[model samples]
Target: RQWQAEKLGEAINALKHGKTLLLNAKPGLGKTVFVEVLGMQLKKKVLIFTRTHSQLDSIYKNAKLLGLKTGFLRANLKDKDVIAMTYPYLFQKPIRNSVFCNKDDCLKLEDYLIVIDEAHNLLEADKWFTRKISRKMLERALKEIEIVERLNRIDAKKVKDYINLLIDYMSKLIKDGRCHELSLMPLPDRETNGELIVVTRAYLNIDEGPVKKSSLKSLLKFVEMKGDLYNCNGSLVKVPSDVNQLIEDALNVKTFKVLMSGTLPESLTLTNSYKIVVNESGRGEYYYCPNVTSELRKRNSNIPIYSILLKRIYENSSKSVLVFFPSYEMLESVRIHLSGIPVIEENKKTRHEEVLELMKTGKYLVMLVMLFESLVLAGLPYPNVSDDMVRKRIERLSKLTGKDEDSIIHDLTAIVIKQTIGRAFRDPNDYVKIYLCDSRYREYFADLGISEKEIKLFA
Candidate 1:
């Protein structure tokens, strides 16, 4: 409680001083509650932005529970102490573009204290940025650019030439018998050839419908401001996104900003911002089982061992249990080895909601896990760097930050681990059990404020 109180004070001070308050507290750790407390005290009305509509409900509910007025609206912000909206919806339309999405109806950032939950998700390169250029998209772009070239006098021919070159280049990738391999095609000197280049990958397709009018407009804008490192799956091309820049332009400003996530991505961890990190030492009991690990090197050999551990845990625990593994490959590898027990399979589309519903009836599930509200068992989630994009992002961030690439990877690993643990421990009074089946987890003990001298040493 003292820690919470102190951080709340610190957050208020930072916001009042016009500095962003980066709260790296886990979920269910009074984040929503703390935001509400600030809402009641601040001179400016508090505006909370989250990725989901469900989260907005919590923000609104909490505000009213504390006797503070609250409303959920992008427009008509007349008289509420606090308000919440999904960031996607808020930024969906750029009616009045003021750096970020500044709509005529919505309230401006300057007058309000803005709190962004799951702040890391906002900076996710794949989600907010990275447009996939499939065959259909190329066709739409051709027509769009054709119109532009005919209408405009200057740079019209230049624009048409580049897009056609892009089309031709992608067409060759399919015909040249390299359609199934991962390849990076850098732009051929933007000075003479224009700035768009398409890297060819075999399976990077985006399955959405045709590009919208708004997105097509954005597509052309991207073409004009071209850079390298765009890849393609069999039929489509994927381009690098400027989401980070756009997010920075919006949040890194004079407004009273509060950025909170269970874990902060190192890419977003720039400098000079005041940060409050709670160790997220929850009431739950954690048993660090070093005997079994989901390490990549040890995965094949340890499959039987992991299966035995799961079987033992399943029989002993009467209530439902959610088992986690480092990757889907490992999860599947261990599942077939899971001898008789009725292990619930949750792959493809993650029905975490389905898992919870079954939990009420007492069931045991085994899968790659995340985003569940309570009771978790997991392996240390060290991300795999096998993917091309993962490596590229790491290399790019490493050059920019000058931090070792491994440190960035470790930072992300800690974020996922902390967030997984955060989901299990909801509140100060809430009691839960955690089983971290990996020795590598000890590296993150300090992040959780777990003293080596405490009750259990890494065993």
Candidate 2:
């Protein structure tokens, strides 16, 4: 369906002025096609950020249908305009490499425009949360230190004692920027490839005597334990060892300032940023609608979801009724009772392609998967049931994910429930049934702070 000529003209005009356009249309409203046409008319390159490779392939195929010279890059961000990169790629390799390097090619604050296609992703940025001194990071650092010490033939126990002292000193250094440098015996880079790498700047200035002694011991132990200090994890983990020498070589001569991400953390004071609020209202809905769903799911005690253990061996049929569980542990427990019935159990190695294929073939009735960043983000398919049936299914999802009633209410408030409930109905005529087994989703809505007038829980 084409937009009204005047309405399309106005959108084109806004794009011309560089006012980032926010499309507030319902699903199946041709938002993607509209944007693509607008991009072509304006000659402004459109770079879409998709969450998964499957989506990227789909988008690329669609773009190719339009005869657009669209290309995608999963690596080396310095080039290409209309590239669609994954969030994980941006967070781990692109951001980390730029941040760790002291070179010109590293990403800077002003380099690119980040357009988030899936607005649910705004909250999902929590997965990209990276900080220098988090508890997990500290634990990882400690583990590295232990490794280096053990490898260096230094006393692991001695290193452990020193590590405690070193942390005390490290705290001081972080606070005051003054600490004693620990002298480390330079270890030869045991590069299966043969390269020389040294761990410099091991200790900083700390004034506490006993604290200083303990800190020094800890620092040395950490240094000896983590022999490969320069090559920690994340982006550093991706860099080829051979090119690492080049990076080191460049760093030896001069220091270069490089910023990693296009959008720095809100905690950092950045200059001149253009904020584009895509799906602002949608995100607001996600936080509001769970409450409604929770209350509805809770009150429908009469329509209790049944959990049955169907064994496979009894029938010797390939078409066995499969049950989906939230986690492997739950799957394991169910599997124990299920031994009475022969069934196939899928592990982490179960490929998404295989699952989707099974779904396509109508072979597998259910797929038990962990409800986390991936599964939750992937739109759950809805049954071709009535509004009442859809409401019940939403209730079950809320319960299984441990989403509080407040969360259910929030989900309802933002119209998130409506959107998610309709996920399976991609084609208006497509119909599917979803059964949710959890009971907890019923009572969680009170926490969302939604009033009755602003929210309506329908059974």
Candidate 3:
């Protein structure tokens, strides 16, 4: 409590000078409490934005604890000093069968102080697009457009006129900045005895020279369907990359903003911002067992070498052990070998409350979790599917920004590891024995400036 109060005081002081603040305190340092106190001190209505419903609820609960009234945006907007909402609820709009938020609505909060929790989520490009339609669906829609116009009967003058009209309409929409919401609706055929038939869809582009000849066959061949594209559902789909624009727009807004997280990526830039780091030692003891190695590169079969080591460690310790794995496959592999103890595995179906309930029971439990599940372990191995995506992102960002990709990877990984280790100790008094099975832990620790003496060698 004392540490949190001190940090809160520093934050208030910084914000008083009209500086946008970024607090990169370690996890479980009572960031919510700090926000509550800061709001109380400023005597200003606070606008809080989070990435999830659970975070919104936690902030509301904390506000109640501080005797502050809070309101949600989706529900009734009763008079409250603090207003909390998820990012999508406030910023996203349904466009072309998808939802998107470009942060244009953020400027509406000119009267309140803005606090963004889990600030790293701002870099997520995936959240920018709302929907994706199949290429086949798009092509069918385009084909239906030509068929409905009776272009098959080939009135040369009539076909060229229709094509120009469609092109002009699309050009006007794009110029007016409303193209993001454009859509195509297919009408049913009238002559097919109540059978559903397709009609013209939205705008489709084609080579200008060939389509100008008014030949229906040539027009169809030149048509190319295009939209903002992304990889999803095992295939590339159409979605826009508006996240970069949204972030830029938010930065330009002249509002007092506070960004709080356990860690922030090194690549993030905040101008006229004061960065505050609460560098207090964590409560739990860390043991680096040099004897323990995942042999990730050599292991072909799902032979639980790490699981066997974990079993011995859990058997010897009287405390509950929470083990982190790189992925679900590894978690499952280890879970099968963890016998003789009450083992709980974190999967997609596992609720956060279930994990909390088990943690509070104080039983000798072995909890197996994936690295991405908690976001506490920073050196998590990327999924195989993400390898190509990450490399491409790094390569593109490198050339444009002139930063080394490897160094960027290392910095991001270190931030993740630091945040992850925070999950084990919820309070300064709470203690748990930590066992990292990955050999990459050393590299992560070294980047974090952790001394070897702090980590004991576990058997």
The CA lDDT of each predicted structure is 0.62, 0.36, 0.55
Locate the minimum summed-lDDT window of 10 residues in model 1.
Answer: 198-207
lDDT of 1 at 17: 79
For candidate 1, lDDT tens digit of each residue in 124-241?
A: 5444444455556666755655444444322444544655666777676543211232445423345424322221110112212353253234444444443334343444435344
Steric clash pairs (candidate 1): 133-236, 133-237, 134-236, 204-233
Candidate with more favorable, higher TM-score: 1 or 2:
1
Q: Give me the runs in candidate 3 sitting further than 4 Å from their true place.
A: 1-18, 74-78, 89-107, 134-233, 238-242, 291-303, 339-342, 348-367, 371-379, 382-386, 395-403, 446-449
Clashes of 1: 4
Worst 10 residues of 3 by lDDT: 193-202
RMSD (Å) per prediction: 6.9, 15.1, 10.9
After superposing candidate 1 on the true structure, give the runs of residues whose Cα lies further than 4 Å from its correct spot.
1-4, 73-75, 88-106, 122-127, 136-222, 232-244, 264-267, 346-354, 370-378, 399-402, 451-459
- Report the lDDT tens digits of candidate 3 across residue range 203-243: 22232343332233323322322334334432233434444
| True-vs-predicted CA distance for residue 178, candidate 1, Å | 16
Candidate 2 lDDT over residue span 190-287, tens digit each: 33112111211132222223434322333333333422121122111111112223222322311111111112112211122233212211112111
Q: Of 1 and 2, which scores higher on lDDT?
A: 1
